[PDB]
Amino acid sequence: NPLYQKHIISINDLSRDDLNLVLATAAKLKANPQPELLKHKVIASAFFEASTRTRLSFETSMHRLGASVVGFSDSANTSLGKKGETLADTISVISTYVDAIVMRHPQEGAARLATEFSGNVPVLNAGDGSNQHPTQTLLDLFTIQETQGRLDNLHVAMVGDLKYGRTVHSLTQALAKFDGNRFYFIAPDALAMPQYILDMLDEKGIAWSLHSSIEEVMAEVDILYMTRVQKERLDPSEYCNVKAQFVLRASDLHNAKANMKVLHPLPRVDEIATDVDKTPHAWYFQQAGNGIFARQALLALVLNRDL
Amino acid sequence: NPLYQKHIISINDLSRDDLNLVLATAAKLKANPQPELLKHKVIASAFFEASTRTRLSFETSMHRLGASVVGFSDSANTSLGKKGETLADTISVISTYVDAIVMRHPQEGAARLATEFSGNVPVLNAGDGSNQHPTQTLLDLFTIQETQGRLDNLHVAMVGDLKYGRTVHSLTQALAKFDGNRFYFIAPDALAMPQYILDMLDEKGIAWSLHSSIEEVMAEVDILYMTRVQKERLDPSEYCNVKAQFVLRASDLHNAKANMKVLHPLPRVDEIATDVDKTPHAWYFQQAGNGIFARQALLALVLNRDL
Amino acid sequence: NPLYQKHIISINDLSRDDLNLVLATAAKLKANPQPELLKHKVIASAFFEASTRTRLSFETSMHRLGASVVGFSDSANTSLGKKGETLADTISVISTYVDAIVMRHPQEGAARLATEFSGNVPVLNAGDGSNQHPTQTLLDLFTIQETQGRLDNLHVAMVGDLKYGRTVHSLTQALAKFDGNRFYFIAPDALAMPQYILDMLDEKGIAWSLHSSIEEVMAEVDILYMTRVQKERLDPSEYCNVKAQFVLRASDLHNAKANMKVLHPLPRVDEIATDVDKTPHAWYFQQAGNGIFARQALLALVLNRDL
Amino acid sequence: NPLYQKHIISINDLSRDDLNLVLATAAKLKANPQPELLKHKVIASAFFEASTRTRLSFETSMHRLGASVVGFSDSANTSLGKKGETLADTISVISTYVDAIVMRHPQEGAARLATEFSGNVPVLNAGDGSNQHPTQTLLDLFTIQETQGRLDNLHVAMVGDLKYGRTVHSLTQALAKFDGNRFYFIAPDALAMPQYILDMLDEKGIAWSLHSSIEEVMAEVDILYMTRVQKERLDPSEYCNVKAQFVLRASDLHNAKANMKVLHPLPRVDEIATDVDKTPHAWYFQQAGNGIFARQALLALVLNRDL
Amino acid sequence: NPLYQKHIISINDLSRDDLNLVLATAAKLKANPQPELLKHKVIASAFFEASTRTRLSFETSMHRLGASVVGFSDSANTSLGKKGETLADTISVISTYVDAIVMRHPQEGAARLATEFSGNVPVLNAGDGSNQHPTQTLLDLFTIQETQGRLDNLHVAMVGDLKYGRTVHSLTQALAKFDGNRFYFIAPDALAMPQYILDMLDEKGIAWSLHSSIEEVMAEVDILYMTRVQKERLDPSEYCNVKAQFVLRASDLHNAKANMKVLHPLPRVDEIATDVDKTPHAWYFQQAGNGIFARQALLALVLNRDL
Amino acid sequence: NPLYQKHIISINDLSRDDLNLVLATAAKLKANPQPELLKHKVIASAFFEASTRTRLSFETSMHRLGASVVGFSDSANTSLGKKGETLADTISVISTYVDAIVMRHPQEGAARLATEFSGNVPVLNAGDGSNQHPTQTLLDLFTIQETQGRLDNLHVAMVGDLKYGRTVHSLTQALAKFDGNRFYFIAPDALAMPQYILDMLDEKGIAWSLHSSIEEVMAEVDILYMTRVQKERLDPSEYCNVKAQFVLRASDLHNAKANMKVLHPLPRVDEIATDVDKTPHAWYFQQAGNGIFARQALLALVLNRDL
């Protein structure tokens, strides 16, 4: 168990074998629950910015494995919020209480920074600004493997705010660990996929391309990964991109392949019309449900050495 | 068990037998706790408006039966609060996590709407604007039965904001399912009992009347059900009714019958003077305590098929 | 077990034997956990002002002993916050639900007041304005005993905001129960140790003195107890004292004794430079960690009669 | 010239001869302007609450007579607004600068209070909370005399917020100084004409009556004086009366007498439909225009001894 | 005198002869002031949105001609601001007081609307949202004629926010009334010159072109008219254009013609570096100073029939 | 006339002869008004922070001499307030309109800075943060000369906030220009008279001393100059000094000399009890009234060359 007590900060820190281990464990737990695997563990749920899916799915997963939970959903009633306490001190103190810390924070690098102050307590990154979202990627991969039967040789389009989308940074890096995947990036110029991601793809000799509409790749993709504009992260010089520039409607799916799935880490705003919800391609709610198995798997592996 | 996996949205959806089943189960649990009845259940506590009694009594009840709890007490740190997510999407995602959803929301019909998006997950309405409050009614009935020995042939006065009082809408409908109850409604004209409630009573041939003071019915009632003006729900054209128009003081109880109990779903503001708290008639804190047994009963029946 | 079902409001209400019992129990639990001691207990975590350490350490302690937790971290989404409910009514209702109430409130005397409305439910004071903080004192004593091997015949300096520091009021009273302790108080004139504390020391014939710098006592102390200026409690006529008047830096420790420990109930603001964190004297994070054992001990003793 | 250097605070302080003198002077100025009557006077325009008509008509009148103006339209940038200065000190200082003070203030009695601090400088009350509005009354009388040819033996209805309407308090008192006027008061019960006004009418043996609609007096009135609900002055227990309870529409004028005029001190909100503006009865804009002649007259008489 | 009592709302309503009359009058007044031309006039200065140049230059001009001024610089202390009065009623009442109304309002068409309610009182448009600014254009033309000796056969570049720039809408229309002018428009795509302006130029057979930098027209222009991004008028989908896209620096003027002048209606933000202020081309402060003569001229012509 | 077109920024820039010229002119105008001295002048009243006395007395003085006034009492509705315009640009533009600028601004050095952008237009400093208030000093000197018959060989106490009191900085410098004055400074340590003032007194060999109560100098002073704590200028580390530390009551005047006058530039807050107002020593309202003659004098001298 390479994941035992491992900090889970960036997909960059995980190997393909690490990913495969989590996915296999998640599949096993989906089939055979272990209500007491983490009995007598107490885990911190430390959310410094808003969340519905990530926090509630993480906490549910903790309880499904028998662990207890303490924490907060915003910093306003913490001593950090009201008394001037630093994040470093906050983590140091919490790490004397709990067996693991799940943390979401608006600043890039906050989770990595937390590991410097958490002593021997594993930190799991539930999102650090626009940087990384490794556990979203674990459930995304689980979902892709479940619907496509594999994680290699896929055609994957990512649409929307790729600049600020921590979801796509992690997912692109993860898929780049498998053979022969092909990427299509569709974003406003201002919210393009960051150069550092593209450079990584080039170093690996991975094929990718840019496009100005969903329509021009619709016939070719196995996975259409839609994203929300990260409104709360935008620089003022980017506010013209607040409205979704690419909106998916049911009619846009006319030439989609039979195996194609529309994914979306959620929440969605204007980028997916609700009429998509009724097509066989809509898979974002199934995807969200898979967060339970992916996160149970990760918690079990990080907190229980014996496989 | 007719309640197994049933959505609990409106008293209108429940039969008298349903009510009797919950009450009998609540009495049984009051006498013989079952700390593990709901072991391995995880329940969502989804509160979109303020609550003390309803949320904490519901969560306590969950723990008393061995269930775990995830959720929120306000929408501000959810993706609905900060990222523009719809309520429908919120429920859809939460329903992939938990075994039941307890939900309170400021908009009439929100709980019913949630059932359209919760898939196979039971929704329990902890209050939907000024509409329904079925679990308050369950504990009210439990309390009335406990102090009066029956739910039929009672004289019941309801006082205060009957227009916006979801408590009295549900309770009136429930009591209308039993034989021979007599209702006295005492409210400002602007906050009168809604016509749809009155029409229902007329269809059943149930006796009711309107009055302009507590004093004129005090000698006749078995139950005096006081309510708070629903200040946060009032239309501007109703702000003159913010102050309690009927205030109960200990001296007003001089001609009360020996069996008479003052109920109040709470919280109270100005409508009950604290000197009432010392009289044998004051029963609102006992009533609140009965929320534990009523809500345990409901949870047990909804989530465990075998009686 | 003298602590069984005892309200824990003020150090004034506890005897030296009471304190010794908690400390011995805490040491025992540190060595031999009891994951099921409080199984089937449900405890209220009722926080009406901000907290990181106190609330999370208390809740963790509850879970470590197998108890469940319900409550809130601020009053904003309670009926007290939104519907005008009194604190008295709030406590009365919560006390019908839970087996104990842990409460922090911004008003001096609030915890004592709560005991008047909690019926047969024990109230544990997690801080009542600038008055008392008994559980901070329990962990402080545990920490002092752990590093000094005793609680008598010590030289203890307290620095910073002693007027509003509920931490030092409780700790001074506790240490005054043991033989031969010597106190050094270092505070701005405006935030001096309250006269009522000093009078108590005089009645017991306890030696104490005032000083205008850390340096003048550094060579003599076993414990340097630093505090944060209670900014949110200051009268406007005291705002000049918001900035720490005594700042501890690593260089100030040049003549500290080898056994000397720097304590701080935390959070800290400007009063301890982070370079202190690396010296052998820094013990505030260890101190915070001891909150788990002290609070487990207190919960176990209050809620389980059999030792 | 009885008005020379007279404080103009309440209609109560003026005699019928005083009123007649202002009106005759206003008529004369309407016919023959005196651009230099007040040359070398400087007058303070001191407005502590909002105004369009009163302030701009007063200042225009000052300039039409050759006077200069200094002052403010709100207290926010005065030392009273930002530095904690009392109203008394404010008036004392301003009275060392100017030849007269025109003052509007939200508190009843403020203008009277100002006269205690203004030394030998005349104060003219442009409205003091819900109390008096003497200069509105002067222009109202001018307008009534202009359209009816007299101020005696009229039938005058006043409609709307009579409780808080400083306009109607002053106007009723003024009209009560002439022979044989008959009053009809039409107001919500909560905003009825104050008892002190009614008592005055009774002492003089003046006929008045209350009515619950405009329609029931429409055929009989010479003057229909409409008013705005004084929203910014209402007690919370009066907020149900924010919406106009009596709305005048053109169709309501079907049985109005040929000489009947609709007056309104303005601003109007919902109480007069704009279709009234086109009928021969609409006279509120003419009325507002007469503020120039009435206020010129008052200024000329107060500030220039020689008639 | 074609301008006598004329509403001055849009440049569209003025002829080339009208413009020439104002300019000739302005030149004459610049050379020979008439301190008493408008003695005994009172003019309203009615500003419903912010202004430095327009309001103060207009009021100064009024005083230079001997007129008096009443009004407001924001609507907050008017009855429109605090009592719910409509703009229409506001204008109707003010028009009974004054001899002319100068009005600036945030809504396009507000000045035109005012003329419907001002009776026989001339309205002068000091800016109506993003629509028209006729008096800015009068001073611009005066300034162009002063520096170029003519208003025909010029090369004029307009730069910045041409969509929301009421300044350039009026100025383009005015210059289109003279022979042979050539326009260069340099704007972000989102803030391009409105189609209705361009269509007008096409109808007249006027040469114009679009460009993406100042540099590409610098060598050819007689007038470089810079503008501020109208931040307070931008739609959210335009917020990316808040920062000036074209910034003029002294070094950019290296190939400017000797007669070239940089104009800017002001205020400027980031679009003109202060090092331009020292070059012979900088003429925006001279331009602002010419507002006095242009506005005196307009006031004199509108309010005094005899030339 | 050395003052003709002179910028009036700091008392430091004026000679004793300059001061004597203003005072003699003020006395002459007090005795013989000149209603047309400044006819055809237009002056800017540019107030960027709150004022009652300074702005209204300045504007009154302008009108008393026949000048007109344009300006603003706060920056909120200027283009500086709403459109991002710099102060420099604001002054540059205003200086093309008016014959002089009276300016008050919250930032030290703002008036001096304005002179760099005002071209040939004189700037008169009505207060620049905590720095200078030259026109307050002119009226103070006028008042001292009026009550003491001289400006030399006086005993003058200054009390309150001397650090932030622009009033006392200017007044101390002015009095230091005359022979043999003796100063007593009474202030909280935190708000002591600035060192740069004290150094100036030392360079001139002027006697001064510090005291901790009004009482210890009461018997010796000719002038008791009280001041308000400059609350809006205080650093947070000074907020303990918000309440007046020295409060003057009528009883404190028991041993005052018969010629002693209490001055206060006003507004006052808590530092002078209103019972002082009735004693012969109270002279602050007379002092404020003298602002008219001092400011008329200054305006006349600055704007009219011929004496």
Curated annotation (Swiss-Prot), chains A, B, C, D, E, F:
Gene Ontology cellular-component annotations: aspartate carbamoyltransferase complex; cytoplasm; cytosol
Listed pathway(s): Pyrimidine metabolism; UMP biosynthesis via de novo pathway; (S)-dihydroorotate from bicarbonate: step 2/3
Uppermost EC category: transferase
One GO process term, biological-process aspect: glutamine metabolic process
Swiss-Prot/TrEMBL catalytic activity: carbamoyl phosphate + L-aspartate = N-carbamoyl-L-aspartate + phosphate + H(+)
GO molecular function, one term: aspartate carbamoyltransferase activity
Binding site for carbamoyl phosphate: R53, T54, R104, H133, Q136, L266, P267
UniProt EC number: 2.1.3.2
Keywords assigned by UniProt, alphabetized: Pyrimidine biosynthesis, Transferase
Pfam annotation, one family: OTCace
Positions that bind L-aspartate: K83, R166, R228
Reported function: Catalyzes the condensation of carbamoyl phosphate and aspartate to form carbamoyl aspartate and inorganic phosphate, the committed step in the de novo pyrimidine nucleotide biosynthesis pathway.
HAMAP family associated with the record: Asp_carb_tr
Family of the protein in this entry: Belongs to the aspartate/ornithine carbamoyltransferase superfamily. ATCase family.
PANTHER family: ASPARTATE CARBAMOYLTRANSFERASE (PTHR45753:SF6), ORNITHINE CARBAMOYLTRANSFERASE, MITOCHONDRIAL (PTHR45753)
Oligomer and partners: Heterododecamer (2C3:3R2) of six catalytic PyrB chains organized as two trimers (C3), and six regulatory PyrI chains organized as three dimers (R2).
NCBIfam families with a match to the protein in the record: asp_carb_tr, PRK00856.1
The protein's name: Aspartate carbamoyltransferase catalytic subunit
Source organism of the structure: Escherichia coli (strain K12)
